[PDB]
Amino acid sequence: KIEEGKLVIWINGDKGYNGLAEVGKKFEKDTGIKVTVEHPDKLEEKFPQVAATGDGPDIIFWAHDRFGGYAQSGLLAEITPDKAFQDKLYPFTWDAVRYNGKLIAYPIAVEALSLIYNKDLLPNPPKTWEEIPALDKELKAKGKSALMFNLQEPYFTWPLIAADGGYAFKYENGKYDIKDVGVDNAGAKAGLTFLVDLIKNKHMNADTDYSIAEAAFNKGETAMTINGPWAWSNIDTSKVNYGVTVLPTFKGQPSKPFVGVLSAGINAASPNKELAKEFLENYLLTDEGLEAVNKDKPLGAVALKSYEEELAKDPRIAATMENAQKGEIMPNIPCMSAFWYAVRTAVINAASGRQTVDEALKDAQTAAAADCAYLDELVELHRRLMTLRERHILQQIVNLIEETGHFHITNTTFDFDLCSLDKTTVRKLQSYL
Amino acid sequence: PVAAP
Ligand SMILES: OC[C@H]1O[C@H](O[C@H]2[C@H](O)[C@@H](O)[C@@H](O)O[C@@H]2CO)[C@H](O)[C@@H](O)[C@@H]1O
Ligand SMILES: N[C@@H](CCC(=O)N[C@@H](CS)C(=O)NCC(=O)O)C(=O)O
């Protein structure tokens, strides 16, 4: 259970959580309600594990891509903004928070990666990925390196993998097809091979993570990095003379970065949905609210039309929207967490030389497709299990699930998740239909 | 997530 008359917010560690807490202080000064902001590790995975048992934050912040899975699991309260509030945010930002025709979260800002470069080490940054090896050889001579970015998260290496034809799923006829997956194609292979070749040629180390790349660029050791708006405030602190520009092209095609919409969703198990709505609509989604988060770690291109009119003057936001128009919006389908686990595995294995590009991507394509196919089976099984009212079959199912041990009894319900059950136990449930 | 009365 979640405490009443108190709001608890969860947001990622790379976002402006101290600035968000400053907005919670204004909320407390005007209403009396205490607001507590937390930034757990792996919060995208913690939220489904705690919100199922009625615990967790009242508000959760993440990009839109994970919200579809939370909505299908019944974890999110359906937000109902009045017509006049909806006109304050850009229409395409509300589309990213729409699942099954319902609005499941409040859009906050649009993010996309950009090429961030150091003007004192490299005033003319490369326009192509292919000229980075020669540039690195020229920079190493001067005691520096060309490029360093997070190689541990597929979000960062995706601009290059999608450049020549890679894609998450086909969005054929206004609906994503979980069968058509563009990870094994020749465009994705061409992209990831280029990346692996940079590492084999010592132009990059496969062990580079977020922190290593952040410190090397901010200390002046590397000429370029690939990061989002949230990173700008730390670069300012380092006093590095930096620019934010277009991501380089690969095989004449532009790098296609994933575009995410930072969203705030209200937990369905929370008794503070009234306070959460008041906080998000009248405190956070205002020029003053967004400015407090943006001053901590930049949001990018905010969803609020009035505050975006001020930020549009910023050439770093122009670079962000330039890269965002060239990339792809993140799909919001519930098997996106399985898609991400697959691409993350293939990228790391190929980068480290543990698998070839063709082998790594074939396994990713195979797993993403299989995990999505099985999840749709579970969604059809769930729809039929809720239409079931025959107390006889319900008792037989309650008994089969009792044998497995995969269940929990609450004051009013007998709970169990179809995802937690063995693929064998699911086949038994089909026989009951 | 399945819940049963
Ligand atoms: O790498 C997979 C990861 O990609 C995206 O996460 C981004 C996020 O959108 C950004 O705001 C920032 O925090 O960097 C993350 C990558 O480190 C997806 O949103 C996420 O679901 C996925 O796991
Ligand atoms: N990317 C948006 C559509 C594009 C949009 O809303 N604005 C700009 C993004 S650069 C655009 O391309 N506008 C096209 C036009 O004004 O004809 C979506 O698919 O939801």
Side-chain angles (χ1 to χ4, degrees), chain A residues 2 4-5 7-21 23-24 27-28 30-33 35-48 50-82 84-87 89-136 139-169 171 174 176-178 180-199 201 203-206 208-218 220-273 275-294 296 298-308 311-312 314-361 363-390 393-395 397-402 404-427 429-433, chain B:
Chain A
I2 302 165
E4 200 192 330
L7 279 173
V8 169
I9 296 164
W10 275 14
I11 186 171
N12 209 37
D14 59 346
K15 304 288 177 303
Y17 54 78
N18 290 307
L20 182 58
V23 180
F27 194 67
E28 195 178 29
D30 294 20
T31 71
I33 305 303
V35 174
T36 301
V37 171
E38 285 155 35
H39 49 93
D41 292 274
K42 313 183 88 195
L43 62 80
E44 71 281 5
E45 293 177 350
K46 296 305 180 307
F47 180 78
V50 295
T53 74
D55 194 23
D58 297 77
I59 308 178
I60 186 167
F61 279 81
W62 199 263
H64 67 288
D65 77 303
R66 297 250 174 182
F67 279 76
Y70 302 151
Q72 266 277 349
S73 295
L75 299 181
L76 304 169
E78 188 209 344
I79 62 100
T80 49
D82 62 299
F85 187 68
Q86 280 179 203
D87 292 307
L89 295 174
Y90 295 97
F92 95 98
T93 62
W94 284 111
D95 291 326
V97 296
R98 193 169 284 117
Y99 192 74
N100 275 177
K102 290 166 167 282
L103 293 170
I104 63 177
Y106 280 93
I108 310 296
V110 193
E111 324 148 351
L113 296 166
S114 300
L115 183 71
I116 295 166
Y117 72 101
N118 171 333
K119 301 173 179 198
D120 295 346
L121 287 179
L122 182 77
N124 306 313
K127 303 289 205 177
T128 63
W129 273 102
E130 299 96 359
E131 74 196 81
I132 284 173
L135 187 61
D136 188 64
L139 280 152
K140 294 275 174 68
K142 302 179 181 215
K144 297 296 164 182
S145 56
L147 175 68
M148 277 182 67
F149 70 101
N150 193 5
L151 297 182
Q152 309 315 305
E153 284 301 324
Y155 178 79
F156 292 86
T157 66
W158 191 255
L160 176 56
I161 299 164
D164 203 19
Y167 59 93
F169 306 94
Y171 188 45
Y176 287 106
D177 179 28
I178 67 156
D180 203 358
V181 180
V183 177
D184 199 340
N185 63 37
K189 285 163 162 162
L192 189 57
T193 302
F194 187 77
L195 188 63
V196 172
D197 280 3
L198 285 175
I199 297 171
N201 284 298
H203 301 306
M204 293 199 312
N205 289 337
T208 310
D209 67 354
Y210 195 87
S211 295
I212 292 165
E214 186 171 47
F217 189 84
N218 299 353
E221 303 161 19
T222 189
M224 293 176 294
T225 189
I226 289 180
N227 219 331
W230 53 81
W232 306 333
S233 56
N234 276 165
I235 322 174
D236 296 320
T237 299
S238 72
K239 307 299 169 185
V240 163
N241 185 9
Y242 74 99
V244 176
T245 189
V246 63
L247 285 162
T249 69
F250 178 60
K251 282 168 108 196
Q253 293 287 298
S255 299
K256 275 96 194 164
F258 262 138
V259 175
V261 169
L262 176 67
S263 309
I266 292 168
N267 196 337
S270 159
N272 308 287
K273 306 193 184 64
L275 299 182
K277 178 195 169 149
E278 168 71 8
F279 175 76
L280 294 165
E281 291 194 356
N282 304 300
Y283 284 73
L284 177 64
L285 283 163
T286 52
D287 291 13
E288 318 97 50
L290 296 173
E291 179 197 279
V293 186
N294 203 80
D296 183 6
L299 277 177
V302 306
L304 196 73
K305 301 177 187 169
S306 54
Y307 195 45
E308 175 61 354
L311 303 180
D314 186 6
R316 311 178 302 176
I317 310 298
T320 302
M321 293 307 292
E322 183 178 2
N323 287 296
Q325 56 99 17
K326 289 170 161 315
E328 43 178 310
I329 191 66
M330 278 187 296
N332 67 355
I333 69 168
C335 65
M336 278 298 290
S337 58
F339 168 84
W340 290 126
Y341 181 82
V343 182
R344 180 180 294 116
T345 301
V347 173
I348 294 170
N349 281 328
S352 58
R354 294 197 186 96
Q355 276 187 310
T356 72
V357 178
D358 307 339
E359 185 189 1
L361 294 174
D363 289 340
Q365 161 97 29
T366 302
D371 295 18
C372 293
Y374 182 66
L375 187 58
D376 289 345
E377 218 159 297
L378 275 304
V379 166
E380 175 64 20
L381 182 57
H382 181 264
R383 184 195 61 87
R384 305 183 66 180
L385 295 174
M386 300 310 288
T387 57
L388 218 69
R389 41 185 64 255
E390 295 85 357
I393 304 169
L394 289 162
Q395 180 69 76
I397 288 175
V398 175
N399 287 344
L400 167 71
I401 302 306
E402 268 171 19
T404 72
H406 275 119
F407 68 90
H408 178 63
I409 300 168
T410 71
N411 296 4
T412 68
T413 59
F414 171 80
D415 294 340
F416 69 98
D417 201 283
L418 300 183
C419 290
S420 79
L421 304 168
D422 301 4
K423 284 192 184 168
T424 299
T425 299
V426 164
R427 304 295 182 262
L429 292 170
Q430 318 277 14
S431 75
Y432 284 119
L433 304 174
Chain B
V2 187

